[PDB]
PDB file of C-alpha atoms in Angstrom:
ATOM      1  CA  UNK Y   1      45.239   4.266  48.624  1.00 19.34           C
ATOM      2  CA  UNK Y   2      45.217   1.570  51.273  1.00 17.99           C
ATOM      3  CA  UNK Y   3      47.374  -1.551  49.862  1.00 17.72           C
ATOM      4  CA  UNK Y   4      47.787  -4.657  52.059  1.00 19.07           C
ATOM      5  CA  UNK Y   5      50.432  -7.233  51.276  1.00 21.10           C
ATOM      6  CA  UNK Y   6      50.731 -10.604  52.946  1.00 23.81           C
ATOM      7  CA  UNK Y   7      53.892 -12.811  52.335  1.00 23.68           C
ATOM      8  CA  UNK Y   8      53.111 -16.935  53.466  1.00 23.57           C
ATOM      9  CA  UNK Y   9      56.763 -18.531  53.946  1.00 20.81           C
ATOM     10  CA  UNK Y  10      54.785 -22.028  53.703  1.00 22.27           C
ATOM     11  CA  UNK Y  11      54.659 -21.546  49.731  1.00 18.87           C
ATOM     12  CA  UNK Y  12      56.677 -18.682  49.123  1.00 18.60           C
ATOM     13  CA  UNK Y  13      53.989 -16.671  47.695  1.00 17.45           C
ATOM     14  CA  UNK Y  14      52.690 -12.926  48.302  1.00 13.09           C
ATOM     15  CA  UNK Y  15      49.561 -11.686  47.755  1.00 13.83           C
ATOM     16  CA  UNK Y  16      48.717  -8.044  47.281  1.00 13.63           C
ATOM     17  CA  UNK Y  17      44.719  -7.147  48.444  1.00 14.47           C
ATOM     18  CA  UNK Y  18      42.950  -3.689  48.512  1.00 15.11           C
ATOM     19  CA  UNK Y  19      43.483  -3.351  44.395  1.00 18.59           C
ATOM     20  CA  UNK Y  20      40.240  -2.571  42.713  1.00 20.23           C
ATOM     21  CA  UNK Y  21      39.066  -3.752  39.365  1.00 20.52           C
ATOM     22  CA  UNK Y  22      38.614  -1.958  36.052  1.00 21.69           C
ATOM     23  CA  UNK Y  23      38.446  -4.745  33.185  1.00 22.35           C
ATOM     24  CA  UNK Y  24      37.726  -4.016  29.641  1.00 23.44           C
ATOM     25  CA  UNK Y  25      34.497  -5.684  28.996  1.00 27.52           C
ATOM     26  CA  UNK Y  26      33.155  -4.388  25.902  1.00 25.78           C
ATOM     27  CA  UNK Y  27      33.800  -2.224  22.799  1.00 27.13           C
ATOM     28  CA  UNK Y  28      32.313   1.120  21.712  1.00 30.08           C
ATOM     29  CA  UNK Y  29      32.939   1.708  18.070  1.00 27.06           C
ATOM     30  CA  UNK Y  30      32.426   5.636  16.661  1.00 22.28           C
ATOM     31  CA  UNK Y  31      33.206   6.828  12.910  1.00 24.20           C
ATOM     32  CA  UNK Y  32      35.515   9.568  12.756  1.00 25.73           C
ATOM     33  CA  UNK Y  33      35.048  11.772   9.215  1.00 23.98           C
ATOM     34  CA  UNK Y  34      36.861  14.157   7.408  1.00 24.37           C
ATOM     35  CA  UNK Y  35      36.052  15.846   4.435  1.00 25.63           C
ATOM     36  CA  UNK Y  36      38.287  16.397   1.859  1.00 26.55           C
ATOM     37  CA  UNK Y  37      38.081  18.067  -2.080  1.00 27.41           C
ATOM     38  CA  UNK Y  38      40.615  16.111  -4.794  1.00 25.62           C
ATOM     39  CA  UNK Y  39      42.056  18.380  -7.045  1.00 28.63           C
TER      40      UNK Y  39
ATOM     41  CA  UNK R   1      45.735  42.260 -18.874  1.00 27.93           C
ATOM     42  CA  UNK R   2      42.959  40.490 -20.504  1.00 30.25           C
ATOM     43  CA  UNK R   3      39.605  42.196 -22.225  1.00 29.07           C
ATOM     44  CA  UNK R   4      36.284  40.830 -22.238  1.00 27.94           C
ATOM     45  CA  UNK R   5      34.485  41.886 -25.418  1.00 27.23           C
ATOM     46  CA  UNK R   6      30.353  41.475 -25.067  1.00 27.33           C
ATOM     47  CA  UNK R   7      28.657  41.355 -28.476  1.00 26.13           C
ATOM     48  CA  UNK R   8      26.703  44.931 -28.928  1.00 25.43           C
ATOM     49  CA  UNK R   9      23.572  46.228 -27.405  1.00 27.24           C
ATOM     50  CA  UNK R  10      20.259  46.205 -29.266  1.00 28.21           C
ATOM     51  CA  UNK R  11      16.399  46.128 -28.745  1.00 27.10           C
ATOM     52  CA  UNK R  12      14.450  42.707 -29.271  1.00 27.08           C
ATOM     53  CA  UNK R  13      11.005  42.096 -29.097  1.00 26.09           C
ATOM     54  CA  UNK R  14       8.859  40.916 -26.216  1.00 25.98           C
ATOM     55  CA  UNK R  15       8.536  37.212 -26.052  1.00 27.52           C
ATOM     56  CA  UNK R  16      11.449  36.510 -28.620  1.00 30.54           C
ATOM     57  CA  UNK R  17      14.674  35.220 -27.511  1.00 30.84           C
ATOM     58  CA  UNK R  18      17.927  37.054 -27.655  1.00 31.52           C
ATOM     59  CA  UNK R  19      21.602  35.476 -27.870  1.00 32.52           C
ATOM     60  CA  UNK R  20      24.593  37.917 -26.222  1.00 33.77           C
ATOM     61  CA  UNK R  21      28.138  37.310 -26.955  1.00 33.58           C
ATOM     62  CA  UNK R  22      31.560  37.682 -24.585  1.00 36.27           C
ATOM     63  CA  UNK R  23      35.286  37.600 -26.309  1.00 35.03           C
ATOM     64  CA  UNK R  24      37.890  36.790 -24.291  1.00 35.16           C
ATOM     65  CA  UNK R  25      41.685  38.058 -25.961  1.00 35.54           C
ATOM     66  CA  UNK R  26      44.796  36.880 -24.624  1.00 34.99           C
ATOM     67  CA  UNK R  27      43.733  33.918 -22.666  1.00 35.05           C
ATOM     68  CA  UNK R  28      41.446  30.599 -23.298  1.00 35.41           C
ATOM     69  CA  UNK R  29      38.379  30.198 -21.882  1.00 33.43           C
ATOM     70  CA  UNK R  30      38.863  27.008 -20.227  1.00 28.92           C
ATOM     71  CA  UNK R  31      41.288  28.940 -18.065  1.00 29.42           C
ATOM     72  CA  UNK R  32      38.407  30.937 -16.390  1.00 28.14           C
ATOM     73  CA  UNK R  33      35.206  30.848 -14.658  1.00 27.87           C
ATOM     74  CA  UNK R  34      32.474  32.645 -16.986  1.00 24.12           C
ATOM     75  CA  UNK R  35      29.791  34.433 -15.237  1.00 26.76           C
ATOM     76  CA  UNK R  36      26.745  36.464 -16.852  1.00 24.51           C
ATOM     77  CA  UNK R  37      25.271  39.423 -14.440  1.00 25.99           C
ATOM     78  CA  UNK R  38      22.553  41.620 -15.255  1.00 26.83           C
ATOM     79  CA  UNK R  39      21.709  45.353 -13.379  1.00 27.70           C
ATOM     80  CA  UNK R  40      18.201  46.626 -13.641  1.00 27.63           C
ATOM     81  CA  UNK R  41      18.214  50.888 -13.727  1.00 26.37           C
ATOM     82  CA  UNK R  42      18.268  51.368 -10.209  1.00 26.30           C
ATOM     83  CA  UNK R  43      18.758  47.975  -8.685  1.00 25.02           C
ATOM     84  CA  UNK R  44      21.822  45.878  -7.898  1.00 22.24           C
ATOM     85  CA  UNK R  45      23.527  43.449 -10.007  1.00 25.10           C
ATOM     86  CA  UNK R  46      22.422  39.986  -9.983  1.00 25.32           C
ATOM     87  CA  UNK R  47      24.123  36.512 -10.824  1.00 27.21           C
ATOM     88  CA  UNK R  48      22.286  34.384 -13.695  1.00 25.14           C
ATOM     89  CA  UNK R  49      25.063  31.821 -14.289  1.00 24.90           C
ATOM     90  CA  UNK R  50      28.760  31.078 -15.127  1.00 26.48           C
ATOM     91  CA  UNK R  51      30.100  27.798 -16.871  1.00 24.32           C
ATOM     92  CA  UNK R  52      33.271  25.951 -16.090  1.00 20.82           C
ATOM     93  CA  UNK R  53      34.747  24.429 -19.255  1.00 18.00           C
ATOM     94  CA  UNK R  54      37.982  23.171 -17.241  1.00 21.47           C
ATOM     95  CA  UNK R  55      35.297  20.879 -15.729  1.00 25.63           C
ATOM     96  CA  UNK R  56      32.247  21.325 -18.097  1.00 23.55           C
ATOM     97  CA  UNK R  57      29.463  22.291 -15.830  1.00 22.01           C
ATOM     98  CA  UNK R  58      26.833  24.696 -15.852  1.00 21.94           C
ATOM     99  CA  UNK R  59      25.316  26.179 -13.083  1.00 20.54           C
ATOM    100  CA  UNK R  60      21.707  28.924 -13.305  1.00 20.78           C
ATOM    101  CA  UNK R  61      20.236  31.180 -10.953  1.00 17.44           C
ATOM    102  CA  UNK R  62      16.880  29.116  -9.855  1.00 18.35           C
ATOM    103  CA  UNK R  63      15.090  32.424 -11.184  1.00 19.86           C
ATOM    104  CA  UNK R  64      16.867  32.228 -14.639  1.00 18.00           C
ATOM    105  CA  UNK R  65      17.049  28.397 -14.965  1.00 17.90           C
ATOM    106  CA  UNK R  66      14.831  26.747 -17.996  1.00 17.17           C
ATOM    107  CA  UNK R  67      14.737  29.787 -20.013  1.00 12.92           C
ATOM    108  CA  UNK R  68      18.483  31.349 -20.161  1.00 11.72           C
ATOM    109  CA  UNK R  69      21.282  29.110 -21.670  1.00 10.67           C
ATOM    110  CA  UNK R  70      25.102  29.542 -21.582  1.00  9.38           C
ATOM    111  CA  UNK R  71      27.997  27.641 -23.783  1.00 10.19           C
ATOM    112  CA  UNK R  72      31.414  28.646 -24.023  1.00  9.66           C
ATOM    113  CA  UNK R  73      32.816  28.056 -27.626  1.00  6.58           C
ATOM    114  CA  UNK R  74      36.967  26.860 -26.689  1.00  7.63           C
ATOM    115  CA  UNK R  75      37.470  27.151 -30.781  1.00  8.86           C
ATOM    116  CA  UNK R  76      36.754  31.050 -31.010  1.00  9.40           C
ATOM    117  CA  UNK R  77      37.129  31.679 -26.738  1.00  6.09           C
ATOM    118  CA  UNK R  78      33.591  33.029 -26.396  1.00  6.56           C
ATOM    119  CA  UNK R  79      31.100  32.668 -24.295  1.00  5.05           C
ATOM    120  CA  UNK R  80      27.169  33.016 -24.768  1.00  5.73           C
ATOM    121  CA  UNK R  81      24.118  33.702 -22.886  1.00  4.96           C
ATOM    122  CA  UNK R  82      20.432  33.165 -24.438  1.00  3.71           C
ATOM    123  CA  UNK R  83      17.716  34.495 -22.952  1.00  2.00           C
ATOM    124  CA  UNK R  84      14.212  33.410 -24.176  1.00  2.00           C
ATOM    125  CA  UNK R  85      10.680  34.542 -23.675  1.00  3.32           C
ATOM    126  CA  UNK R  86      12.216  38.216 -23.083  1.00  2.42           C
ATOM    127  CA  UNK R  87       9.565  40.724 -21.580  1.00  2.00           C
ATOM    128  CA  UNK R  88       9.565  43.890 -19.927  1.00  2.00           C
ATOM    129  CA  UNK R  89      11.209  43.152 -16.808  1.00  2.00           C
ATOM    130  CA  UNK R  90      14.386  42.196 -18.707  1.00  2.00           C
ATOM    131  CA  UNK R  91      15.475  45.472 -19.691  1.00  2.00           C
ATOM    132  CA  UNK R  92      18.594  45.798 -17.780  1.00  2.00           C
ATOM    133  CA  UNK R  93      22.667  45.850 -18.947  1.00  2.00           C
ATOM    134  CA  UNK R  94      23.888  42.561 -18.950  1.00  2.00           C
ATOM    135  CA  UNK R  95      27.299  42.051 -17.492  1.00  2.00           C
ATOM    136  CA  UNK R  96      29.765  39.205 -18.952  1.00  2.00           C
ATOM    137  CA  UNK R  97      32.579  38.547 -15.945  1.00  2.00           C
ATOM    138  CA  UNK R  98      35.306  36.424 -15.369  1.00  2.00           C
ATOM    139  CA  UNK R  99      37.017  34.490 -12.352  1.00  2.00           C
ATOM    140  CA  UNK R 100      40.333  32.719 -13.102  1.00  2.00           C
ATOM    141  CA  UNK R 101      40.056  28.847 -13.000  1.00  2.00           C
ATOM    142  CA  UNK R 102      43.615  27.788 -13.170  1.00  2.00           C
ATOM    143  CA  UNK R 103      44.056  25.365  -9.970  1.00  2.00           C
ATOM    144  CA  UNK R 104      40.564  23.991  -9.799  1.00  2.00           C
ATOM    145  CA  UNK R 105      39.374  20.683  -8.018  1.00  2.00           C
ATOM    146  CA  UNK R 106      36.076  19.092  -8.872  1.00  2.00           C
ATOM    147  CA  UNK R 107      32.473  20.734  -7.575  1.00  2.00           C
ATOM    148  CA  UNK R 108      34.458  24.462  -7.530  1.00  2.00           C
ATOM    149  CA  UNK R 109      32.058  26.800  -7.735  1.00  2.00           C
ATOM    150  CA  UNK R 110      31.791  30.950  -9.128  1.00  2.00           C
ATOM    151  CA  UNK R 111      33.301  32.978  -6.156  1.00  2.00           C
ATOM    152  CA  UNK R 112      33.835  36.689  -7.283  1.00  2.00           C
ATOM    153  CA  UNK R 113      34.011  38.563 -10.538  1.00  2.00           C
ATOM    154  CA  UNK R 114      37.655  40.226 -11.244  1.00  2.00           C
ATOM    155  CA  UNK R 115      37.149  40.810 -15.134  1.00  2.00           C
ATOM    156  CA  UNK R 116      34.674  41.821 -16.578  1.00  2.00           C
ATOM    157  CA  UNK R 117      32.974  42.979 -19.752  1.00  4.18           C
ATOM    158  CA  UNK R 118      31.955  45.797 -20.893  1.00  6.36           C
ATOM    159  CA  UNK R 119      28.351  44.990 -20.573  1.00  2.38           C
ATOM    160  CA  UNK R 120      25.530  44.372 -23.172  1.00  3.13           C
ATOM    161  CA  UNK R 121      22.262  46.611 -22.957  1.00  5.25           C
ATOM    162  CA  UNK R 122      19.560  44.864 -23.824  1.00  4.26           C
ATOM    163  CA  UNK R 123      16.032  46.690 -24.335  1.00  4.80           C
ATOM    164  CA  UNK R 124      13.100  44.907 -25.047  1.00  6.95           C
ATOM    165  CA  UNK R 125      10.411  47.147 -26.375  1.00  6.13           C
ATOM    166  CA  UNK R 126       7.582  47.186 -29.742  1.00  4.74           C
ATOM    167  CA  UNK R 127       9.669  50.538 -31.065  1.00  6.01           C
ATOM    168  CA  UNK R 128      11.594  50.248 -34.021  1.00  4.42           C
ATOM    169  CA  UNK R 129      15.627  51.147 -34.130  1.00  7.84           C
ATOM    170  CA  UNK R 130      16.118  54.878 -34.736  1.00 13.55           C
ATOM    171  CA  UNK R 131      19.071  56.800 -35.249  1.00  9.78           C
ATOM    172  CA  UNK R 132      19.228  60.138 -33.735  1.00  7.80           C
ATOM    173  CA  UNK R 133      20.211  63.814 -35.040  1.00  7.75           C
ATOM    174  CA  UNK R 134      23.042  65.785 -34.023  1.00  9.45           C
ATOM    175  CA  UNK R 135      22.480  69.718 -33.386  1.00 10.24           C
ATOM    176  CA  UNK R 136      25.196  71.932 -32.843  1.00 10.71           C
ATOM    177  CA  UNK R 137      25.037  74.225 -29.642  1.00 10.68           C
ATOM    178  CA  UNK R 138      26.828  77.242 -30.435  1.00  7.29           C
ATOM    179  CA  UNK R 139      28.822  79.638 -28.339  1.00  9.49           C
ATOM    180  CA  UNK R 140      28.725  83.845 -28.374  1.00 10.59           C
ATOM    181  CA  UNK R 141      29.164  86.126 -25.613  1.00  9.07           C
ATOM    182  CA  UNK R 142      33.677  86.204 -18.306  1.00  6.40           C
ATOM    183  CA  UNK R 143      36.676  84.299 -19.352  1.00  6.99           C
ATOM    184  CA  UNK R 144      35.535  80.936 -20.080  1.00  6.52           C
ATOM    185  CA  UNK R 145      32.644  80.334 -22.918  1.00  6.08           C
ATOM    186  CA  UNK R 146      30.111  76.729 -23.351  1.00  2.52           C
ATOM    187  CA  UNK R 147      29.664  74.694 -26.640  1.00  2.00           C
ATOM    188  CA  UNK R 148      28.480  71.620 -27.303  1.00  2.00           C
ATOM    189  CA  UNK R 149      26.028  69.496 -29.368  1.00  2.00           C
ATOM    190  CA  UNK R 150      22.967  67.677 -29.237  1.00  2.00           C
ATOM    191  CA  UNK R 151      21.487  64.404 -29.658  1.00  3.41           C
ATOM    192  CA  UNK R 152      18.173  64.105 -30.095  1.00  4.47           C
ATOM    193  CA  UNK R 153      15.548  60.822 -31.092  1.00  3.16           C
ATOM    194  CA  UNK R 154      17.057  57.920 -31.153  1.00  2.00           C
ATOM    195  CA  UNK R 155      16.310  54.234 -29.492  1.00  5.33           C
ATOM    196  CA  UNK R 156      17.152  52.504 -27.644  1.00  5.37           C
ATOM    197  CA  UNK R 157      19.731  53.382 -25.366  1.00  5.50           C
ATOM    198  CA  UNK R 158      22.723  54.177 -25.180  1.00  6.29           C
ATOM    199  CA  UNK R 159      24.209  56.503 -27.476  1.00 12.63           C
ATOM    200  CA  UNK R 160      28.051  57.143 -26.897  1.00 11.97           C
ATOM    201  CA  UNK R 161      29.941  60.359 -27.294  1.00 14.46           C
ATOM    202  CA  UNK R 162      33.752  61.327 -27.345  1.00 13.54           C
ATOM    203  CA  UNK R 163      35.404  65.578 -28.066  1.00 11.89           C
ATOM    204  CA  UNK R 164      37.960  65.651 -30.043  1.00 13.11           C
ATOM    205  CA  UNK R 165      38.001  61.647 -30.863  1.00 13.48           C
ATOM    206  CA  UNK R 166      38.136  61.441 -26.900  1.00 11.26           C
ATOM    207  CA  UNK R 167      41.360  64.294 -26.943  1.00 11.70           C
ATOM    208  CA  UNK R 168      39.211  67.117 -24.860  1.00 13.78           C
ATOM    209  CA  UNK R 169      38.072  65.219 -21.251  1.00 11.89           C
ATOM    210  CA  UNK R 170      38.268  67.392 -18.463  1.00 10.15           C
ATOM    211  CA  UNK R 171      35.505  69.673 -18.470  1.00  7.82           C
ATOM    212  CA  UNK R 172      33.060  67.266 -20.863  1.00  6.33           C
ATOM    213  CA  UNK R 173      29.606  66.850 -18.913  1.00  9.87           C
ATOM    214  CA  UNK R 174      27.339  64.283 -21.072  1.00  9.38           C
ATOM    215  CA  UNK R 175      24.036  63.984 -19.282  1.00 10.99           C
ATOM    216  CA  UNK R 176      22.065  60.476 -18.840  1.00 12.98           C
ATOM    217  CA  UNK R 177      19.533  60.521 -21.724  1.00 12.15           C
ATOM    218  CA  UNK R 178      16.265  61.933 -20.916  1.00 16.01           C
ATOM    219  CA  UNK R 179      12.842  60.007 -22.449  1.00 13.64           C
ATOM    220  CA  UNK R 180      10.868  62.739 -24.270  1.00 10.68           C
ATOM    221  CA  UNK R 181       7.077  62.405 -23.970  1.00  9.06           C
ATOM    222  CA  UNK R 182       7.501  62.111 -27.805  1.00  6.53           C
ATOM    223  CA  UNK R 183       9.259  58.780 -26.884  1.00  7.35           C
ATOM    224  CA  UNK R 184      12.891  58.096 -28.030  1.00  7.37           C
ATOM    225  CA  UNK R 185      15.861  59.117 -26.284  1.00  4.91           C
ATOM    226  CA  UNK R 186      17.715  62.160 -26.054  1.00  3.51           C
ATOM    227  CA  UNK R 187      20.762  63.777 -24.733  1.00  2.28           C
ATOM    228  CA  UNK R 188      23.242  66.205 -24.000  1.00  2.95           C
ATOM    229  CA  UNK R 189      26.915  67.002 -24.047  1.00  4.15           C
ATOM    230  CA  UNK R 190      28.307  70.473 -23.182  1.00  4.68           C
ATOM    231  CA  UNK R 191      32.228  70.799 -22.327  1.00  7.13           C
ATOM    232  CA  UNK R 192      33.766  74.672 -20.815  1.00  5.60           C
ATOM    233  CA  UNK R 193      36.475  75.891 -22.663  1.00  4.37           C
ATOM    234  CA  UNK R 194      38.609  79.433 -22.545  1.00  5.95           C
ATOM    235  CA  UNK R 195      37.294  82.050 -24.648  1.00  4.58           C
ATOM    236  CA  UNK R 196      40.481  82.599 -26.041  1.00  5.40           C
ATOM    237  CA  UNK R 197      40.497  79.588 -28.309  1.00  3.94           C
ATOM    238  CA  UNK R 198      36.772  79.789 -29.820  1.00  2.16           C
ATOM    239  CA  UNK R 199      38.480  80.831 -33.126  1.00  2.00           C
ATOM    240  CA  UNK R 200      41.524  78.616 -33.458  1.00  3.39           C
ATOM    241  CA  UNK R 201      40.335  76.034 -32.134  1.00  2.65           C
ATOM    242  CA  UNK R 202      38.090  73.011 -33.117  1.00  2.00           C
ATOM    243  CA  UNK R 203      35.447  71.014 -31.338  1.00  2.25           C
ATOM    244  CA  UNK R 204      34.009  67.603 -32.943  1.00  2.59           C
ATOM    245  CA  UNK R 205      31.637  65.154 -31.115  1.00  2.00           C
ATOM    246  CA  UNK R 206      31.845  62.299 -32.113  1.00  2.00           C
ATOM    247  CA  UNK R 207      28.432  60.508 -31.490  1.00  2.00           C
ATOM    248  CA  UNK R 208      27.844  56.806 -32.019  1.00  2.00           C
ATOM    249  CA  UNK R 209      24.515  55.005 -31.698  1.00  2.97           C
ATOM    250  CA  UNK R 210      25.748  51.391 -32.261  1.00  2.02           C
ATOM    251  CA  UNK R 211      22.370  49.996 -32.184  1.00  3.79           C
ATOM    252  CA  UNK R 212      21.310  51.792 -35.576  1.00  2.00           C
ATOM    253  CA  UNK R 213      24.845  51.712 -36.712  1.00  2.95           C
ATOM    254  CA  UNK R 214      24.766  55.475 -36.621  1.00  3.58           C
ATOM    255  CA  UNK R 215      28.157  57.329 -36.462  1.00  2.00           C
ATOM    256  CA  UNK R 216      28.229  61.316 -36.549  1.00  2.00           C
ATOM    257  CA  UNK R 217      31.301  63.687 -36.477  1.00  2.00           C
ATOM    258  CA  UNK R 218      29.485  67.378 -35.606  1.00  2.00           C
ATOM    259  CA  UNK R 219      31.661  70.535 -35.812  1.00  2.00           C
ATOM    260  CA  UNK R 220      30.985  72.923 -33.343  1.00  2.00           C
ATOM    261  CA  UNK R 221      32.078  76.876 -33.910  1.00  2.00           C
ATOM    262  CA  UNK R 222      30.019  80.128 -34.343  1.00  2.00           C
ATOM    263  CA  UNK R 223      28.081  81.485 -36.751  1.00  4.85           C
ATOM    264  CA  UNK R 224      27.896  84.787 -38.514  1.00  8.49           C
TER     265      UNK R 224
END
């Protein structure tokens, strides 16, 4: 966990490197059952 | 608390059909799950089928299925089981039990049998219904003496047997009916009793043969 962090006075900014990535590209999609007996 | 009343046992012939009754008193039959087992002499019981009139289906043992039907009448509260094409294999006591069906959801099935009948014997043979005869076994001459009666020739089984109009019980011995080479049934019932009370005493057996519609009240006591 090695986090670099770099502040530039020209434009007041800060930027925060070292972060990795973990986006959410896709969907998985399962059927969940239960079964029941009606009285 | 409640009694399940079969119809009565009887012989039919091979390849005829056969229709066996089962009264229910004190409850409806809708209430219940009605099951029909036989027992073969010397096997276990089996399960043909039960109905379930709180749902109205009908469920049969694959073996029994296509030739054994069962209805349950809700105007009279009995239940029915026909057998067809009856052959020597059938002979067995068929059983008429219960399970209670009060809280039922749909596709409930026959779990267990808590009531049951009395059973039904069927026999299916060529011999005709014969009543039998009742012979008296007499006592004579340490402190204890043997009477009794016998019953001899009838079919089928079973022929029933009470001392005393079922009063005198402990010490009765009625043996399973032996088959004669003759044919027909035949059997025994012998009860102890003190020697003190051969004269003042009286012994009746009281032996029924329902299938014949035979019923026999034989004094026992010496002779001289």
């Amino acid at each position: 966990q090695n986090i670099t962090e770099e502040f530039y006075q020209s434009t007041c900014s800060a930027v925060s490197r070292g972060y990795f990535s973990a986006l959410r590209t896709g969907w998985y999609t399962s059927v969940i059952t239960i079964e029941l007996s009606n009285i | 608390q409640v009694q399940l009343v079969q119809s009565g046992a009887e012989v039919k012939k091979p390849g005829s059909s056969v229709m066996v009754s089962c009264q229910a008193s004190g409850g409806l039959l809708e209430d219940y799950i009605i099951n029909w087992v036989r027992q073969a002499p010397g096997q276990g019981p089996e399960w043909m089928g039960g109905i379930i009139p709180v749902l109205g289906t009908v469920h049969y043992g694959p073996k029994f299925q296509g030739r054994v039907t069962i209805t349950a009448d809700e105007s009279t509260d009995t239940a029915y089981m026909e057998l067809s094409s009856l052959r020597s294999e059938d002979t067995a006591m068929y059983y008429c039990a219960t399970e209670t069906a009060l809280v039922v959801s749909e596709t409930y099935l026959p779990h267990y049998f808590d009531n049951w009948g009395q059973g039904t014997l069927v026999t299916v043979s060529s011999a005709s219904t014969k009543g039998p005869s009742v012979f008296p076994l007499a006592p004579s001459s340490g402190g204890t003496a043997a009477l009794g009666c016998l019953v001899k020739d009838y079919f089928p089984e079973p022929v029933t047997v009470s001392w005393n109009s079922g009063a005198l019980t402990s010490g009765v011995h009625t043996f399973p009916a032996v088959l004669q080479s003759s044919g027909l049934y035949s059997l025994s019932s012998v009860v102890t009793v003190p020697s003190s009370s051969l004269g003042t005493q009286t012994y009746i057996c009281n032996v029924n043969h329902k299938p014949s519609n035979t019923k026999v009240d034989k004094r026992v006591e010496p002779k001289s």
